[PDB]
């Protein structure tokens, strides 16, 4: 602001500086215009070129980012909206509830069954039902077709108080919304960020002297994203699954403003359907399909834009930015983040310089299985269409050894919402249906079985063949693969074979596919496999950052890849159905165009440890809570606590080779001569004299016509013979409970390598939620003796929900290592927990966590040295120390934890953190400053408010059960009742959805939690030897499974959480109004202060 | 100084300007005293000599069952052609002038008593079509193991029955044994001529083994169904005469030669170069029995036999790798002492696809795809069930493997008796028999025993004898089993996923070999009647899965396969759909060509030698090949468990794999860099399709480059050894074209490069950068370079920028104001600060600068020579020769006076 | 242009940077600083 008449270098003709060392950098007199709208952005970072001499930048950020969190909230607004809200809160208020319904005047236009099945030479035969024929054909027409069999719609929104849609001018009367749009920010210069490159002299009279200056244009972005995000509402499916998508009131497409505003320059303000750009609603089901205007296209806003800047890194002759952290602009529960990395070149030695930016999606479309060593089937890869949406948290990327790493966190694409819910079952999933609306913001992923359909992806047409039900809708069923027909040859070339598909024509076969949450997934979601740009079943990208990530980017390749990007045909959508309906994965791209260029840029990635199966949530249950230090299993010091995560030890022993088709299993799944596993809590089984394996009890009666009714003329078929046989498996698993765990059940089984990334990464954030019946009232405490019988979880006495839980954990477990009864967390048990009572319906809902650790938080990337690095997450430390260099038999990272209570607990606590580094005698270290811990602006104003947000705030729905049975409770899913009106009711139990409230009651929400007055003190993570973390003796063992062999070594190391590399950060305490760091190769200095004049080498001059 | 062929028989000596040389463009046919039926095969220089392997149209070999030399020339008929490899040297006054240096031949393989009895009754399959369907790949399946074994009428008593039949606990009652020959894609003898038609659908079409049926009438029908040169019908046939030409199979109008003269032309096909020997092998398109290995001293008429590749026992990785691929080529003691075949007679697999060669630190390097061997017989009576059949069957690992590749690749499964077929298990179709040993259901119940698929019964009176396929698979049967083992579909459904080996189907060949046991094989081929085998020790194959996506259907490869994927639609290859983008309308039968060695130039920690790393291409994805220079052997830690560490299969992308595989012309490694280039022309595809429509899209032209990425071995000590196997990583350049014919190829420079190409008579000048393996088109630059007044340099001028900027000397008095004046003529003259500072230089591009160099023209005034760099990074001035030729550029050499003598 | 005490070292909420190490010939860091004035 104040440097008068500063100059730039007098380079020479060709562009190089001249630089006499003692008369310094030559001076031009003038520095690089634009002083009146440069001068007034403030320094906030700086970087160095090595390969080209003395060279060095400053990246120039607008203050406005500065004194962001001190706007006034009535312009920067939350997403959640809360006024007044003097009526209790209720949390479904604000979400859209009513389920669709049939028309009652397109009832000709469902999907036709074939008129007669194609022989073929057919020697098998089939009872069932029969196909349905869909085919679109282009015939001749230019806004219509001649048949769209998709585009039937025989559902409807029910008109319940009139249509129930979204639609934003009354789905939110105050909207979120950004500041300044990508163009607004684009022609704006003093308002955008600027990389300036310049030249120091620390010893020449002509100290400083400055290179050029550069400016960061979203314009770049905005010309470099591939055609199809410019229509986020459509997806490559786009036409079956819009309308589906319609019809139960949730996404349209893939990255919507509705679940994610922050990219789009309108904001939430289209947080609608209309405008998806193509042809939708309109009365003619062949004539919607044809595109037209897109009106929603995906941009850089003021928000994430600024977000977009950080971390930059510079090789050769161009630098990167490779995006901030989102902090600065992040508020209470919105989620901004960068979404594509920027880069800037130099010509003619730094003469001149082109600005230009990428989006990470291509970045990341090169990603298989085989490049990490860490958890497999993610949902990462992509297709053809770059409907993935990937947004990287940087933890700093930093030139690790000879290698160029990326670090921190980055969104998943949404595996929650994978699958649906049926037409007339959305009154009672609360859960997922706002976890889908877009009403509930939180990432995990719930566990409500009953309502699935058979595949998440039959168009609506095929819906409504069986809208009783009772006949069990062999196209259209809710899931329940107690019914799964047998994958036996007969069966299936008498059910699907016959059924041939063309390439005009495709067949929904009546067969009844169906599975568990873990079969929907490892079907219909976007799991990595060995080939890259492989995932054809996209549905939705996450809400939060719930993917730990630290991958190597090819330093040389970043180099050369070019500044703009060329799309062809296929980068864009499909132009018309007939075209859609034979959709490919693989087309050859127009030569003449560069964007698949930047495909294979990924070395490799990991988020976890180099671990695999129910091993790795062994791990997870190894890992501490920082909010009591206890971990989750507990079982050092019957009716005892159980491991919530790990299912090992937990319920009885069953056989897989009685599961299903009872014939080859002994030796698949299990490399034992007794393949024993262990069901899990929540199981069910005949008796205590047969537990392997449950028969067929598991009938569904839809009305009370009598059960599912197997071996019945239809559920039977016949092969060539006559030889009928039933086509539904005798023995069934014996779990279907929210932890359930089947290594040979693929379709029973529910712990998925979604749910163990995001629980890795919001366990060790700390703030993993939970489900409650009772608070701590009097008269309304679920108290412990009487009502908590671990040993026996297959009855009501286990306590376990079956629905509304987190999807992978056990309820019971999570609450005692929580505290919320007993003396884990308070003095005082908080008589908080929940009952499977039985005496009439039980109305529950989830909570936070207390804590409020989010999820975009992360260090600066401490490089320890060429063979591993970290940075801190949360109140933990990770080190990626076997990641570059993974080594077999280490569990493959370190951790550290946090000491300070106050800090732990305080509302924003990330206000505290003031930066990362490695301290130089080998460890690194973190600031904290108690005293600058940012709480909500208000205490909820001054009368008291039932909702008060916070990082991890979010509207957890009430989930109302039916009642269950005394005894074998969980033969079948826990049916739900209609909980649409059930938040009344349960007003006590609301009260602990909020974090302020949640402390309250756990006794530390003042500072009344004693011990450090303010902790203002530096944190250093735990030493670690090259062997910390080695698990070599602990894995192998083939005499049982990885999971169980891996619990009794942690059982038998479990109070040795340091070699393991699991502790607490050693804390000093220094008086000081501690603000950041400087660095000094000798030696970094803390806050500016502890000025050295080279003691060593004192006595020479 | 560049060097490479516009045609067929000419090479020309190009300007690092990407200026042809007037008198360079060589005949070569005339120099080295070659009849004009001759054409150039390729080129590798090799301490300044530009070696050449040269093929002819009029080649003509005759096969005998009768006589020692069973193998020779088509004297008779004026055909005898041996193709010749020339060394060349450019010995002269420093000047473009090939001449002839030593004219070594190319002998016909030397026929043995026990591979001439075999060959007396081999076949082989018909080759690989561009547009070849994998209907037609496959064809109808064949009776099972116990339905022939105990016949029919056999059921409700196997596990009483197996025991006795030398197949104890065996769990799969309905293994297969392959394909039946009555009908399909057609197979045929050394002595018999390969039809020009490939069935389209093996369900019913095709011949056969059935020689005689297929002259009977098949031959008129299969004529009329795709006659050859849109009214035609094409429904069970394709005539593949052009396909044919162009993959290089020479014919006599419209019939071929016969099958041992197409088989010679085509293993006369690639070259090496070692400091003691020159090694020739043959193309990837088709497998070659044989191959020359050729010391570099021998006589100019030097009887120069090739050597087959049963006389050279490879290294598969492991001696089960030897033993599973032995076993399953036919029965051990076949008793019928005429029935020859390759395991009668101690051979190996003898039919490799192989992908290319080369040569770095006089160390040749070999890769590609094994093609399959196996029995038939030839028996037709009383005949017997088997009987014209192909006996196949694929040899997966089974599920209960335990963990370690090593382990995967030592199991039993597979040994002799075939074991994998249809099974059903949880919810869904491992393929894959799920035990091995003796793990069952119950438990241990008894080890699995097998044994070849021959009844004893039949043992005294079958006729079996070796065939060839030609494409890497084994068992073209339409099932299941085999389509999974070739898209590579099947995975254990253990927690830690482990890839299943294919033990001897779809493997792939690799590894080094020294010129020790190269001159060994030279001495085995010397040897005659007596044969004697050869051993390989630093070479390694492992099971490469076929790109799994290119099967339509197929979607996600894991264990836990979709119901669906059960059905025959989509689980058998007649009903198997194809939608690879590669130039293979096939989805199944794998190809490869283009191995390139080179020395990776980035440096080396000292102790260590330069590392180099092989690269070998594959559709799909490439693969690097790995090796520690410690022991110049394959790399390799000593964790059995971990996959070997040589080999690391990368995945491509959509616009890299729709690359047609069929135009892979030359290889460029730009040493230097450190990256090598896969150029590639649709030219060199088939100017007609198989249905007689022209083809569309027969100009346009691409590369494909290769870099280096994830860890480098003795970059530091800390990575001595290594865990992980490195990668390559292709890409696509930028450099590509849809109507422009390219002329020849320029590595010029780390940060330049260029190419020539001819679309309208008229060369097209198209210079590009490297920003280490990018290329891009500077047509400010570009355009400039063409002013070269039809010379080898572009001209300067001094009115606009060109591709030497703008040099402008200062004025005359610059001495004068900078008081240079004083100073004496030879102070300035040692002064290289001062002499620059002569002239402002303002370059037209990157690494671009104008100096001077010390001249005198007299005392009072000296004359200064401007000397400057091109994109080649070569300084150049009036004095610049190259080949002794001044490169007369033009220079005006800026002249200043006032210069003392004090 | 000479070292002022008012300002203060500091970091910055997105990206937490004050402190490069320097190397090569004059080792140090670009220090960032900012004016710790409240109010």
Not at chain 1, 1044 to 1063: A, H, P, R, Y
Not at chain 2, 876 to 899: E, K, Q
Request: glycine letters at 8%.
């Amino acid at each position: 602001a104040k440097m008068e008449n500063p100059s730039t270098v007098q380079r020479g003709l060709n562009g190089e500086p001249i630089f006499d060392p003692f008369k310094g950098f030559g001076l031009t007199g003038n520095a690089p215009t634009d002083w009146n709208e440069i001068k007034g952005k403030v320094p906030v970072e700086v970087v160095q070129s090595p390969h080209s001499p003395n060279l060095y930048f400053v990246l120039l950020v607008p203050k406005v980012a500065l004194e962001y969190h001190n706007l006034n909230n009535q312009v920067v607004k939350e997403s959640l909206e809360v006024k007044a809200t003097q009526s209790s809160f209720n949390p479904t208020q604000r979400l859209q509830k009513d389920s669709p319904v049939k028309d009652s005047s397109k009832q000709g236009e469902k999907l036709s069954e074939t008129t007669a099945s194609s022989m073929s030479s057919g020697m098998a035969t089939s009872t069932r039902a029969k196909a349905l024929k869909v085919e679109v054909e282009r015939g001749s027409q230019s806004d219509s077709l001649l048949k769209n069999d998709f585009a039937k719609k025989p559902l409807k929104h029910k008109n319940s108080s009139g249509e129930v849609k979204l639609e934003a001018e009354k789905e939110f009367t105050e909207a979120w919304k950004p500041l300044l749009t990508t163009d607004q920010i684009a022609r704006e210069k003093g308002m955008g960020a600027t990389v300036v490159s310049f030249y120091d002299a620390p010893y020449s009279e002509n100290h400083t002297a400055f290179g050029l200056v550069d400016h960061i244009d979203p314009k770049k972005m905005v010309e470099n994203y591939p055609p199809s995000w410019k229509t986020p509402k459509w997806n490559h499916h786009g036409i079956w699954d819009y309308n589906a998508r319609n019809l139960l009131l949730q996404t349209t497409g893939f990255f919507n403003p509705r679940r994610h505003p922050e990219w789009f320059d309108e904001g939430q303000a289209k947080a609608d359907n209309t405008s998806p750009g193509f042809k939708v609603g309109d009365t003619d089901h062949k004539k919607d399909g044809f595109k037209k205007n897109s009106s929603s296209p995906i941009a850089l806003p003021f928000e994430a834009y600024f977000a977009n800047i950080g971390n930059m890194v510079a090789i050769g002759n161009s630098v990167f930015i490779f995006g901030g952290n989102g902090h600065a602009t992040k508020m209470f529960t919105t989620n901004p983040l960068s979404i594509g990395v920027f880069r800037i070149k130099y010509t003619d030695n730094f003469s001149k310089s082109s600005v230009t930016g990428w989006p990470y999606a291509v970045l990341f479309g090169g990603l298989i299985n085989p490049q990490t060593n860490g958890l497999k089937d993610l949902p990462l890869g992509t297709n053809r269409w770059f409907e993935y949406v990937p947004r990287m948290a940087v933890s700093g990327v930093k030139w690790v050894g000879n290698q160029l790493v990326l670090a921190g966190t980055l969104t998943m694409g949404d595996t929650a919402t994978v699958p649906r819910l049926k037409y007339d079952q959305l009154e009672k999933h609360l859960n997922l249906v706002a976890q889908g609306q877009g009403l509930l913001r939180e990432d995990l992923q719930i566990f409500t079985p009953y309502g699935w359909a058979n595949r998440p992806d039959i168009p609506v047409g095929a819906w409504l063949q069986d809208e009783m039900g009772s006949k069990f809708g062999p196209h259209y069923f809710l899931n329940n693969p107690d019914i799964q027909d047998n994958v036996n040859n007969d069966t299936v070339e008498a059910l699907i074979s016959s059924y041939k598909n063309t390439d005009k024509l495709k067949h929904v076969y009546p067969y009844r596919y169906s599975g568990l949450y873990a079969w929907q997934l490892f079907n219909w979601s976007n799991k990595l496999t060995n080939t890259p740009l492989s995932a054809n079943f996209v549905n939705e990208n996450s809400y939060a950052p719930n993917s730990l990530f630290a991958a190597i980017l090819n330093e040389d390749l970043l180099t050369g890849l070019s500044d703009k990007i060329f799309y062809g045909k296929e980068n864009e959508f499909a132009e018309n159905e007939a075209d859609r309906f034979n959709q490919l994965l693989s087309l050859n791209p127009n030569p003449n165009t560069n964007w698949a260029r930047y495909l294979n840029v990924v070395q490799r990635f990991t988020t976890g440890p180099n671990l695999d199966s129910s091993t790795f949530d062994q791990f997870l249950d190894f890992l501490p809570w920082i909010g009591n230090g206890k971990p989750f299993s507990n079982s050092p010091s019957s009716s005892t606590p159980l491991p919530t995560f790990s299912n090992i030890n937990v319920g009885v022993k069953s056989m897989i080779t009685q599961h299903l088709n009872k014939e080859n299993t002994r030796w698949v799944f299990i490399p034992n001569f007794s393949p024993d596993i262990w069901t899990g809590a929540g199981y069910r089984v005949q008796s205590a004299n047969q537990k392997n394996g449950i028969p067929f009890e598991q009938v569904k009666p839809s009305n009370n016509s009598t059960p599912f009714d197997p071996n019945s003329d239809d559920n039977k078929v016949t092969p060539s013979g006559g030889s009928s046989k039933p086509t539904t498996y005798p023995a069934l698993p014996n779990s279907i409970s929210p932890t359930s765990d089947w290594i040979n059940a693929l379709t029973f089984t529910n712990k998925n390598n979604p749910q163990r990334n995001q629980l890795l990464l919001r366990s060790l954030l700390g703030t993993i939620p939970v489900l409650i019946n009772k608070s701590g009232d009097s008269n309304d405490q679920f108290n412990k003796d009487s009502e908590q019988k671990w040993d026996k979880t297959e009855t009501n006495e286990g306590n376990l929900p079956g629905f509304g839980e987190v999807n992978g954990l056990y309820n019971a477990a999570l609450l005692h290592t929580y505290g919320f009864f007993g003396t884990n967390t308070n003095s005082t048990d908080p008589k908080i927990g929940f009952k499977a009572d039985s005496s009439s319906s039980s109305s529950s809902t989830l909570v936070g966590s207390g804590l409020n650790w989010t999820s975009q938080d992360v260090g600066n990337l401490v490089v320890i040295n060429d063979t591993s690095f970290g940075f801190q997450l949360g109140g933990w430390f990770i080190t990626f120390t076997d990641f570059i260099r993974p080594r077999t038999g280490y569990l493959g990272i370190t951790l550290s934890s946090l000491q300070d209570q106050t800090i732990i607990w305080a509302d924003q606590p990330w206000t505290s953190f003031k930066g990362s580094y490695l301290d130089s005698d080998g460890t690194p270290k973190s600031l904290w400053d108690p005293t600058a811990l940012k709480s909500l602006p208000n205490s909820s104003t001054t009368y008291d408010t039932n909702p008060t947000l916070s990082p991890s705030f979010q509207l957890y729905q009430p989930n109302k059960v039916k009642a269950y049975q005394t005894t074998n409770t969980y033969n079948k899913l826990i049916e739900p009742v209609d909980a649409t009106s059930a938040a009344t009711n349960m007003t006590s139990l609301l009260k602990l959805l909020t974090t302020k409230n949640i402390k309250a009651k756990l006794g530390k929400g003042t500072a009344s939690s004693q011990g450090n007055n303010n902790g203002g003190g530096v944190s250093q993570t735990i030493n670690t030897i090259t062997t910390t973390g080695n698990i070599s003796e602990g894995l192998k063992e083939e005499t049982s499974i990885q999971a169980e062999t891996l619990k009794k070594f942690f059982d038998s190391k479990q109070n040795n959480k340091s070699e393991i590399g699991i502790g607490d950060s050693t804390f000093t305490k220094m008086d000081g109004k501690l603000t950041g760091v400087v660095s000094t190769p000798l030696v970094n200095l803390i806050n500016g202060q502890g000025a050295t004049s080279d003691s060593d080498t004192e006595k020479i001059s | 100084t560049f060097l490479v062929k516009e045609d067929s028989k000419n090479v020309t000596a190009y300007t690092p300007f990407a200026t042809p040389i007037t008198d360079s463009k060589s005949d070569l046919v005339s120099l080295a005293q070659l009849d004009s039926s001759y054409q150039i095969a390729d080129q590798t220089i090799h301490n300044t000599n530009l070696f050449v392997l040269f093929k002819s149209r009029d080649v003509k070999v005759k096969y005998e069952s009768s006589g020692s030399n069973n193998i020779s020339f088509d004297s008779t008929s004026q055909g005898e052609k041996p193709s010749y490899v020339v060394e060349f040297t450019n010995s002269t006054n420093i000047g473009i002038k090939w001449t002839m240096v030593k004219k070594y031949q190319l002998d016909v393989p030397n026929v043995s008593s026990d591979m001439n009895q075999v060959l007396k009754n081999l076949i082989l399959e018909q080759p690989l079509t561009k547009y070849t369907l994998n209907s037609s790949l496959a064809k109808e399946k064949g009776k099972t193991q116990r339905e022939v074994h105990l016949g029919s009428g056999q059921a409700n008593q196997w596990t009483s029955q197996r025991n006795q039949h030398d197949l104890n606990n065996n769990p799969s009652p309905n293994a297969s044994t392959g394909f039946k020959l009555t009908t399909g894609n057609a197979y045929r003898k050394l002595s018999e001529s390969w039809p020009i038609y490939e069935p389209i659908d093996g369900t019913k079409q095709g011949k056969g083994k059935d020689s005689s049926g297929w002259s009977s009438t098949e031959e008129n029908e299969a004529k009329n169904d795709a006659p050859s040169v849109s009214s035609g019908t094409f429904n069970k046939y394709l005539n593949t005469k052009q396909a044919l030409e162009s993959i290089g199979i020479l014919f006599d109008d419209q019939t071929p030669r016969n099958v041992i003269t197409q088989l010679y032309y085509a293993s006369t096909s690639k070259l090496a170069v070692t400091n003691n020997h020159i090694v020739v092998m043959g193309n990837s398109f088709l497998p070659s029995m044989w191959y020359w290995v050729v010391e570099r001293s021998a006589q100019e008429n030097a009887s120069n036999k090739p050597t087959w590749f049963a006389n050279t026992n490879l290294d598969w990785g492991e001696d089960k790798q030897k033993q599973f691929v032995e076993n399953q080529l036919g029965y051990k003691e076949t008793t019928s002492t005429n029935s020859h075949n390759f395991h009668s007679k101690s051979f190996t697999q003898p039919a490799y696809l192989i992908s290319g060669i080369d040569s770095v630190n006089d160390q040749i390097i070999f890769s590609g795809f094994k093609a399959g061997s196996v029995g038939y017989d030839s028996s037709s009576s009383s005949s017997s069930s088997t009987k014209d059949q192909a006996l196949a069957w694929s040899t997966t690992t089974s599920l209960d493997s335990k963990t370690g590749y090593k382990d995967l690749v030592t199991n039993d499964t597979g040994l002799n008796g075939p074991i994998n077929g249809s099974f059903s298990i949880q919810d869904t179709f491992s393929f894959v028999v799920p035990y091995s040993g003796n793990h069952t259901n119950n438990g241990t119940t008894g080890p699995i025993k097998t044994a070849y698929p021959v009844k004893k019964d039949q043992k005294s009176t079958v006729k079996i004898n070796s065939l060839i396929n030609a494409t890497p698979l084994n068992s073209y049967g339409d099932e299941g089993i085999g389509v999974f083992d070739a898209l590579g579909l099947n995975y254990n459904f253990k927690s830690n996923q482990e890839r299943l080996p294919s033990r001897t189907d779809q493997i792939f060949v690799y590894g080094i070999v020294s010129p020790n046991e190269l001159r060994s094989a030279k001495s085995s081929a010397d040897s005659t009647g007596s044969d004697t085998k050869v051993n390989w020790s630093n070479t390694q194959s492992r099971y490469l899965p076929v790109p799994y996506n290119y099967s339509e259907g197929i979607i996600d490869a894991d264990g836990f396969k979709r119901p669906e994927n059960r059905g025959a639609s989509v689980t058998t290859f007649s009903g198997l759909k194809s939608i690879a983008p590669d130039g293979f309308a096939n989805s199944i039968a794998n190809f490869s060509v283009g191995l390139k060695a080179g020395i990776d130039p980035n440096p080396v920690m000292s102790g260590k030698k330069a590392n180099y790393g092989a690269v070998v291409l594959t559709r799909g994805g490439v693969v690097r090949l790995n090796f520690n220079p410690g022991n110049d052997s394959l790399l390799s830690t000593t964790d059995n468990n971990i996959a070997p560490i040589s080999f690391s299969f990368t995945p491509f992308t959509a616009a890299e794999s729709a690359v047609d595989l069929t135009t892979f012309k030359e290889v460029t490694y730009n040493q230097e860099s450190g990256l090598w280039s896969y150029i590639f022309d649709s030219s060199l595809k088939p100017s007609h399709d198989g249905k007689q429509t022209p083809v569309t899209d027969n100009m346009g032209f691409s590369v494909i480059t290769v870099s280096r990425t994830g860890i480098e071995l003795n970059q530091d000590q800390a990575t001595t050894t290594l865990d992980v196997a490195p990668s390559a990583l292709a890409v696509q350049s930028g450099i590509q074209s849809t109507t422009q014919t390219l002329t020849g190829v320029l590595p010029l420079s780390e940060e330049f490069s260029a190419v020539i190409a001819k679309d309208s008579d008229q060369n097209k000048i198209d210079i590009y950068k490297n920003n280490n393996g990018l290329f891009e088109i500077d047509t400010q630059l570009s355009n400039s370079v063409a002013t070269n007044n039809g010379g080898l340099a572009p001209s300067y001028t001094e009115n606009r920028v060109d591709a030497w900027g703008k040099v402008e000397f200062a004025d005359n008095s610059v001495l004068q104001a900078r008081n240079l004046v004083d100073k004496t003529v030879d102070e300035i003259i040692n002064t290289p600060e001062i002499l620059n500072s002569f002239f402002r230089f303002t370059p037209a591009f990157e690494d671009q600068k104008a100096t001077l160099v010390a001249t005198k023209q007299s005392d009072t005034s000296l004359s200064v020579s401007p000397r400057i760099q091109f994109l080649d990074g070569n300084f150049y001035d009036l004095n610049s020769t190259i080949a002794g030729v001044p490169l007369n550029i033009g220079f005006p050499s800026r002249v200043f006076a006032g210069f003392a003598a004090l | 242009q000479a070292v002022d005490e008012t300002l203060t070292p500091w970091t910055w909420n997105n990206n937490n940077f004050s402190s490069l190490k320097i190397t090569g010939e004059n080792p140090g860091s670009f220090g960032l600083v900012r004016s710790q004035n409240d109010n």
